[PDB]
A paper describes a structure:
The [name] tetrapeptide binds in two locations in the [name] [name] peptide binding groove. The primary [name] binding site (Site 1 in Fig. 4) overlaps with the corresponding residues in the BCOR and SMRT peptides, and its binding mode is like that of these longer peptides. The interaction of [name] with the [name] peptide is mainly driven by polar interactions. These include H-bonds between the carbonyl group of Met51 in [name] and the side chain NH-group of the peptide’s tryptophan residue, the side chains of Arg24 and Arg28 in [name] and two carbonyls of the peptide’s main chain, and between the side chain of Asn21 in [name] and a carbonyl and an NH-group in the main chain of the [name] peptide. Hydrophobic interactions further stabilise the peptide.
B-cell lymphoma 6 ([name]) protein, a member of the Broad-Complex, Tramtrack and Bric-à-brac ([name]) / Pox virus and Zinc finger (POZ) family of transcription factors, plays a key role in the formation and maintenance of B-cell germinal centres. [name] has an N-terminal [name] domain, responsible for obligate homodimerisation; a long unstructured central region involved in interaction with the MTA3/NuRD complex; and six C-terminal C2H2-type Zinc-fingers involved in DNA binding. Disruption of the SMRT or BCOR corepressor interaction with the [name] [name] domain is sufficient to inhibit DLBCL cell growth. We established a robust, soakable, high-resolution [name] [name] domain crystal system which allowed us to elucidate the binding mode of all nine hit series and map the binding site hot spots in relation to the binding of the corepressor peptides.
Residue numbers in the entry:
A (entry chain A), C (entry chain A): 6 to 129
B (entry chain B), D (entry chain C), E (entry chain C), F (entry chain B): 0 to 4
């Protein structure tokens, strides 16, 4: 109502969360993707992905410190999506779009799937 | 986009 | 470089973090302010406040599930600042500006202190 | 920054 | 939404 | 605003 807003707040919060991840501060889960490990914060994963939201709201899976993804998942595809979760920037290229799209479908990140479909249709 | 319930 | 950006990403992440707080999902700390308790996520507090960043990077304080603030701190002032951390909106009013400013000085949130000083100087 | 939301 | 940063 | 080191 009588609220004022700090424009850069949400992006500053995101940048600071990424610095915590980068420095391994308060990370509480290891995501394993075909023998490669990625440290992260469960709250950030839940806040970006429908799959991680369903995993960490489960009464048993919420307690796990290690989550293994389907080994057919591309770790570069996962890494591109994890970087997007922590920064808002999606490094989408001709050489990775198919892997990024398949990973976003798996992670239930519809906005990413949508942009991938648009970039593919523009190329065809 | 993803919005949590 | 070849990155695309989802404009609403950071604000959607923040809105989802606030929904997790509201539903008490993965909250990992209780902030006590003159016998009133506020549940939160340590990572969000660290990402917004210099004081919480110093507390939760300390090798002993990082393990605490309860943090007591100075009892002279105003809980409404704290609540306004916690709501700002989780939403980007600061409910700054004539009746609370002095308490909000003192709380922001204590929490080391310089951008909030700055806007308070500007609103006070405009009134004088 | 500060703006009117 | 998607934009050029 | 606050930017973490």
């Amino acid at each position: 109502d009588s609220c004022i807003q700090f424009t850069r707040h949400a992006s500053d919060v995101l940048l600071n969360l990424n610095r915590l991840r980068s420095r391994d501060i308060l990370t509480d889960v290891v995501i394993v993707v075909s023998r490669e490990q990625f440290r992260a914060h469960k709250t950030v994963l839940m806040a970006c992905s429908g799959l991680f939201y369903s995993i960490f709201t489960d009464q048993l899976k919420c307690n796990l410190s290690v989550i293994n993804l389907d080994p057919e998942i591309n770790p570069e595809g996962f890494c591109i999506l994890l970087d997007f979760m922590y920064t808002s920037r999606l490094n989408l290229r001709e050489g990775n779009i198919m892997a990024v799209m398949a990973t976003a479908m798996y992670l239930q990140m519809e906005h990413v799937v949508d942009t991938c479909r648009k970039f593919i249709k523009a190329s065809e | 986009a993803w919005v949590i319930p």
